[PDB]
Amino acid sequence: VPFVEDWDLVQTLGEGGEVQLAVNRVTEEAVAVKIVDMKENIKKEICINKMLNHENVVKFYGHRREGNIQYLFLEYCSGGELFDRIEPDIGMPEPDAQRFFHQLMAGVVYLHGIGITHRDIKPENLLLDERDNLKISDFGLATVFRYNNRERLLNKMCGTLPYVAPELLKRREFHAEPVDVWSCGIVLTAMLAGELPWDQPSDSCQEYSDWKEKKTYLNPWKKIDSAPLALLHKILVENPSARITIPDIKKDRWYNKPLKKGAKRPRVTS
Numbered sequence: 070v071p072f073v074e075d076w077d078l079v080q081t082l083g084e085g086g087e088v089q090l091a092v093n094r095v096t097e098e099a100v101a102v103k104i105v106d107m108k109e110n111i112k113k114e115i116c117i118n119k120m121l122n123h124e125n126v127v128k129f130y131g132h133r134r135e136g137n138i139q140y141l142f143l144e145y146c147s148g149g150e151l152f153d154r155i156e157p158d159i160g161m162p163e164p165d166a167q168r169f170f171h172q173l174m175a176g177v178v179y180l181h182g183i184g185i186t187h188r189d190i191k192p193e194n195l196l197l198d199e200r201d202n203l204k205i206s207d208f209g210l211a212t213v214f215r216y217n218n219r220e221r222l223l224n225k226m227c228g229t230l231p232y233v234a235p236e237l238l239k240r241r242e243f244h245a246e247p248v249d250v251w252s253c254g255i256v257l258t259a260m261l262a263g264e265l266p267w268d269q270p271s272d273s274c275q276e277y278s279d280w281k282e283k284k285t286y287l288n289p290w291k292k293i294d295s296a297p298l299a300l301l302h303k304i305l306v307e308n309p310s311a312r313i314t315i316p317d318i319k320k321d322r323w324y325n326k327p328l329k330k331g332a333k334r335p336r337v338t339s
């Protein structure tokens with residue numbers, strides 16, 4: 070079949086390598102093409118992506134090298150970013166946030182199960198497909214924390230300051246999994262309050278001190294109902310050894326609270 074290998078680049082999706090929306094010449098199938106001018110970092114991204122296969126992880130179709138430029142063929146998520154579903158100082162309806170949080174946990178359970186830590190979980194990196202299914206995106210900062218059933222402790226500073234766990238700023242070494250759990254908690258906070266609680270999780274940050282002192286009558290905590298707030302009290306624990314794990318997040322009362330109706334299906338009467 071001539072021309073199935075040809076894709077037209079029709080619009081920019083994101084920057085930081087650059088990603089463009091590509092449309093197949095014959096089939097009109099939409100894919101995301103990450104264009105990286107290597108001019109090692111992308112080599113690790115391709116190889117971590119080759120290990121991944123999950124409905125809540127951006128699909129990797131392959132890669133092609135044309136000299137100094139790498140082309141990564143990735144799943145196009147038409148719904149855009151979770152960031153744009155968050156209304157400033159408001160958030161989103163609690164049943165929507167619960168559904169997105171369920172899909173975020175399935176994705177993170179998957180990655181941790183194969184020994185992969187994302188290390189930069191934030192709403193900008195959580196993409197939505199045509200049915201608003203959440204997909205974990207960008208494995209550029211991702212790494213292996215478990216190999217041959219042996220855990221390797223991390224020491225490298227990675228992520229985005231409002232989403233990083235406090236042990237990354239206080240300790241030389243730390244476990245990978247509680248770090249991803251913490252960032253998921255900050256994502257949950259943003260979805261339910263439309264604001265970030267602190268610039269960074271340090272004692273020098275008044276908002277972080279107020280949280281450890283349990284001043285929940287202050288924003289963003291005042292905008293959040295008692296049931297998801299009780300979960301955030303278990304996730305946003307300073308000591309990573311005392312912080313709730315994903316198996317226990319899945320047993321939480323709000324996590325299991327019936328809230329959202331299934332996608333509106335066409336129906337007629339009489």
Ligand SMILES: O=C(O)Cc1ccc2c(c1)NC(=O)c1ccc(Cl)cc1N2
Pocket residue numbers: 082083084088090101144145146147148149150196
């Ligand atoms: O087509 C559109 O404009 C909607 C849209 C907007 C932003 C994104 C996507 C889709 N989908 C995406 O898959 C996407 C891919 C890479 C990057 Cl860096 C950002 C993305 N976000």
